[PDB]
């Protein structure tokens, strides 16, 4: 089994050479340190610019310090820090959405809605499995989220891969001839669901928290024009379609930090938390230490250098922890065309 | 489930557990990647130990 | 020299450098309701689902009631008129939505 | 994009095209594996570049670079065999 | 942070921070419980 981590990357950092002579020797340095870092994931986007995602600041300090020093002996540009973000739907989707196989005859339509608080988390944590028997899902289902019964029997699979928080439900009213050419079709949408779901419509990224239940599909002749490589697009199209519709918006990690700081030093650590979009959980005395604990929660995107603003304006003490806690929404509404900002 | 470097930058050293089985310097092994299965018997590379 | 306000060096510029904060700068719902129709049929199909778990539970008691006349497997209590049965659900909850439009 | 244009040409001879999760370690872009049916024996992996389809010869190292190959050679070598 | 990062040197990241603090009169005995240490008090567990 492949390893599983305890956190995620969620901090992306883009490089390119000094001067372009030197691509390859840095290419081959990426190569290198991807073997290298575990959670390092090396990307190439549209652009040609290769990004970089690493847990924290100290994490890419020491990557870019072995990738300028160990593998690959040239100069390099480092871009600012950006967090890694993801897309979901706040609500359910306006209208139903549909589309057509190229041969214009199958028929695919789906809706889509957010998720319950819990789904997303116990998918993660393992609460449920796919490699389950069908009767273990549908009563675990049943049982924590009060959800009724074809609904549970109908969840076919998660995305993207197992562990994903996307669900793909079918509703096609029973009443079903084609029991045997749904069953044909299904182990073949599921791969367009993966695919889908994979890669945002909303921006290359994945998708999270939305279930993508299948409403009406309507296909009358004989197999010979049931081709997976024909069906594949409608079935990704269909998923943007209605997740599009769905009124999306964009999800944002946010850390979990821990301050270790005297009780003289809480009121600069709250300063720098309400500034930085950041709020306390818990501030309790440490039992058997004269330090004062905090704990706090600060989105990837605002915590650049929280640990050495912290430091400096606590004349060194106040040492703290970022942790990598959760995803959450950020607050505006990423398709609002009535928005201007200044750009600086 | 890791890869050390050597004191110089140059080549990585596989850092492994036998699970069963004996292993020589020489031998023959096929390496298995991260998603290599019945689908996927693309990942499969065959290579030495030296 | 410190968050890019400065010059390298003093040398060079009648200047000792010496930069100051300026002091005076100015911080300043759903359109195809057949979505609701269709969940209420898939609630109305898993209800008919609920009803024919309840039948394999008659089938069940059925089963028992066969054996102990026996002893004075398992068995199906009905294998289709239970689909009558349920004809007439579907009748009446095609009532019920008649009688919940004409409401509306 | 050539994206779509090979996605419709295998919509259109009623292949399959199935992305493997996987990265080139030269060129890094998403490698597919394209199969005619259930069989799986005859699969063709493929990766894009510059609007050409690239395959590389079965039982060859990694380190050696995939060659080019047309839609023609394709039917040519899945409609023979 | 900066491209261009040449000559540049790495510093001690962290040193465990010293809870040593000097008795303040003689007579008091070496060990002794200071009242600045917050008291162990932490019923709000759930053992075995």
Redesign the interface.
């Given at each position: 089994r492949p390893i599983a981590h305890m956190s995620e990357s969620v901090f992306k950092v883009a490089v390119e050479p000094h001067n372009p002579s030197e691509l390859p020797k840095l290419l081959d340095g990426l190569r290198k340190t991807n073997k290298s870092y575990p959670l390092s994931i090396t990307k190439v986007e549209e652009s040609g610019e290769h990004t970089i995602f690493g847990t924290g600041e100290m994490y890419m300090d020491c990557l870019l310090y072995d990738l300028r020093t160990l593998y690959s002996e040239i100069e390099i540009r480092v871009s600012d820090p950006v967090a890694r973000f993801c897309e979901t739907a706040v609500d359910t989707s306006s209208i139903k959405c549909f589309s057509d196989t190229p041969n214009k005859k199958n028929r695919i339509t789906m809706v889509v809605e957010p998720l319950e608080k819990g789904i997303s988390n116990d998918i993660e944590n393992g609460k449920v499995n796919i490699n389950w028997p069908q009767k273990r899902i549908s009563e675990f289902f049943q049982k924590n989220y009060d959800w009724d019964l074809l609904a549970s029997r109908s969840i076919w699979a998660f995305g993207p891969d197992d562990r994903g928080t996307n669900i793909l439900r079918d509703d096609t009213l029973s009443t079903d001839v084609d029991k045997n050419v749904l069953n044909s079709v299904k182990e073949y949408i599921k791969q367009g669901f993966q695919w889908g779901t994979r890669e945002g419509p909303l921006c290359d990224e994945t998708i999270r928290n939305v279930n993508f239940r299948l409403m009406d599909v309507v296909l009358a002749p004989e197999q010979i024009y049931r081709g997976g490589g024909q069906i594949i697009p409608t079935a990704r199209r269909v998923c943007y379609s209605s997740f599009l519709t769905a009124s999306p918006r964009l999800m944002e990690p946010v850390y979990m930090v821990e301050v270790h700081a005297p009780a003289d030093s809480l009121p600069i650590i709250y300063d720098l938390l309400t500034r930085r979009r950041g709020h306390v959980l818990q501030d309790i005395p440490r039992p058997g230490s004269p330090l004062y604990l905090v704990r706090a929660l600060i989105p990837v995107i605002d915590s650049c250098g929280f640990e050495t603003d912290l430091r400096v304006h606590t004349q060194g003490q106040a040492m703290c922890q970022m942790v990598f806690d959760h995803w959450q929404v950020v607050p505006g509404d990423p398709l609002d065309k009535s928005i201007k900002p200044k750009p600086l | 489930?890791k890869?050390y470097?050597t004191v110089d930058?140059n080549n990585?050293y596989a850092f492994a557990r036998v699970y069963s089985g004996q292993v020589k310097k020489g031998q023959k092994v096929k390496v298995l990647?991260?998603?290599y299965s019945?689908?996927?018997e693309?990942?499969m590379?065959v290579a030495h130990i030296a | 020299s410190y968050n890019g306000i400065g010059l390298p060096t003093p040398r060079g510029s009648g200047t000792n450098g010496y930069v100051m904060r300026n002091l005076s700068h100015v911080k300043k719902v759903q359109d195809p309701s057949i979505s609701e129709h269709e969940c209420r049929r898939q609630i109305e199909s898993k209800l008919l689902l609920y009803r024919e778990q309840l039948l394999e539970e008659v089938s069940s008691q059925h089963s028992t009631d066969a054996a102990a006349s026996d002893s004075n497997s398992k068995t199906k209590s009905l294998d289709e008129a239970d689909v009558e049965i349920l004809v007439q659900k579907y009748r009446e909850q095609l009532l019920k939505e008649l009688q919940l439009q004409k409401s509306t | 994009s050539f994206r779509e244009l090979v996605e419709e040409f295998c919509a259109e001879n009623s292949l399959l095209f199935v992305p493997l999760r996987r990265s080139h370690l030269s060129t890094g872009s998403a490698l597919f594996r394209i199969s005619t049916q259930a069989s799986k024996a005859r699969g063709i992996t493929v990766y894009l570049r510059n609007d050409i389809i690239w395959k590389k010869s079965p039982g060859a190292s990694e380190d050696t670079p995939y060659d080019p190959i047309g839609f023609n050679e394709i039917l040519l070598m899945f409609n023979n065999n | 942070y900066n491209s261009r990062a040449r000559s540049v040197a790495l510093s001690e990241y962290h040193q465990p921070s010293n809870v040593f603090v000097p008795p303040e009169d003689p007579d008091l005995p070496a060990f002794f419980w200071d009242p600045i240490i917050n008291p162990i008090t932490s019923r709000q567990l759930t053992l075995h």
């Open positions: - | 489930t890869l470097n930058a990585f990647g991260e998603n019945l689908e996927d693309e990942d590379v | - | - | -």
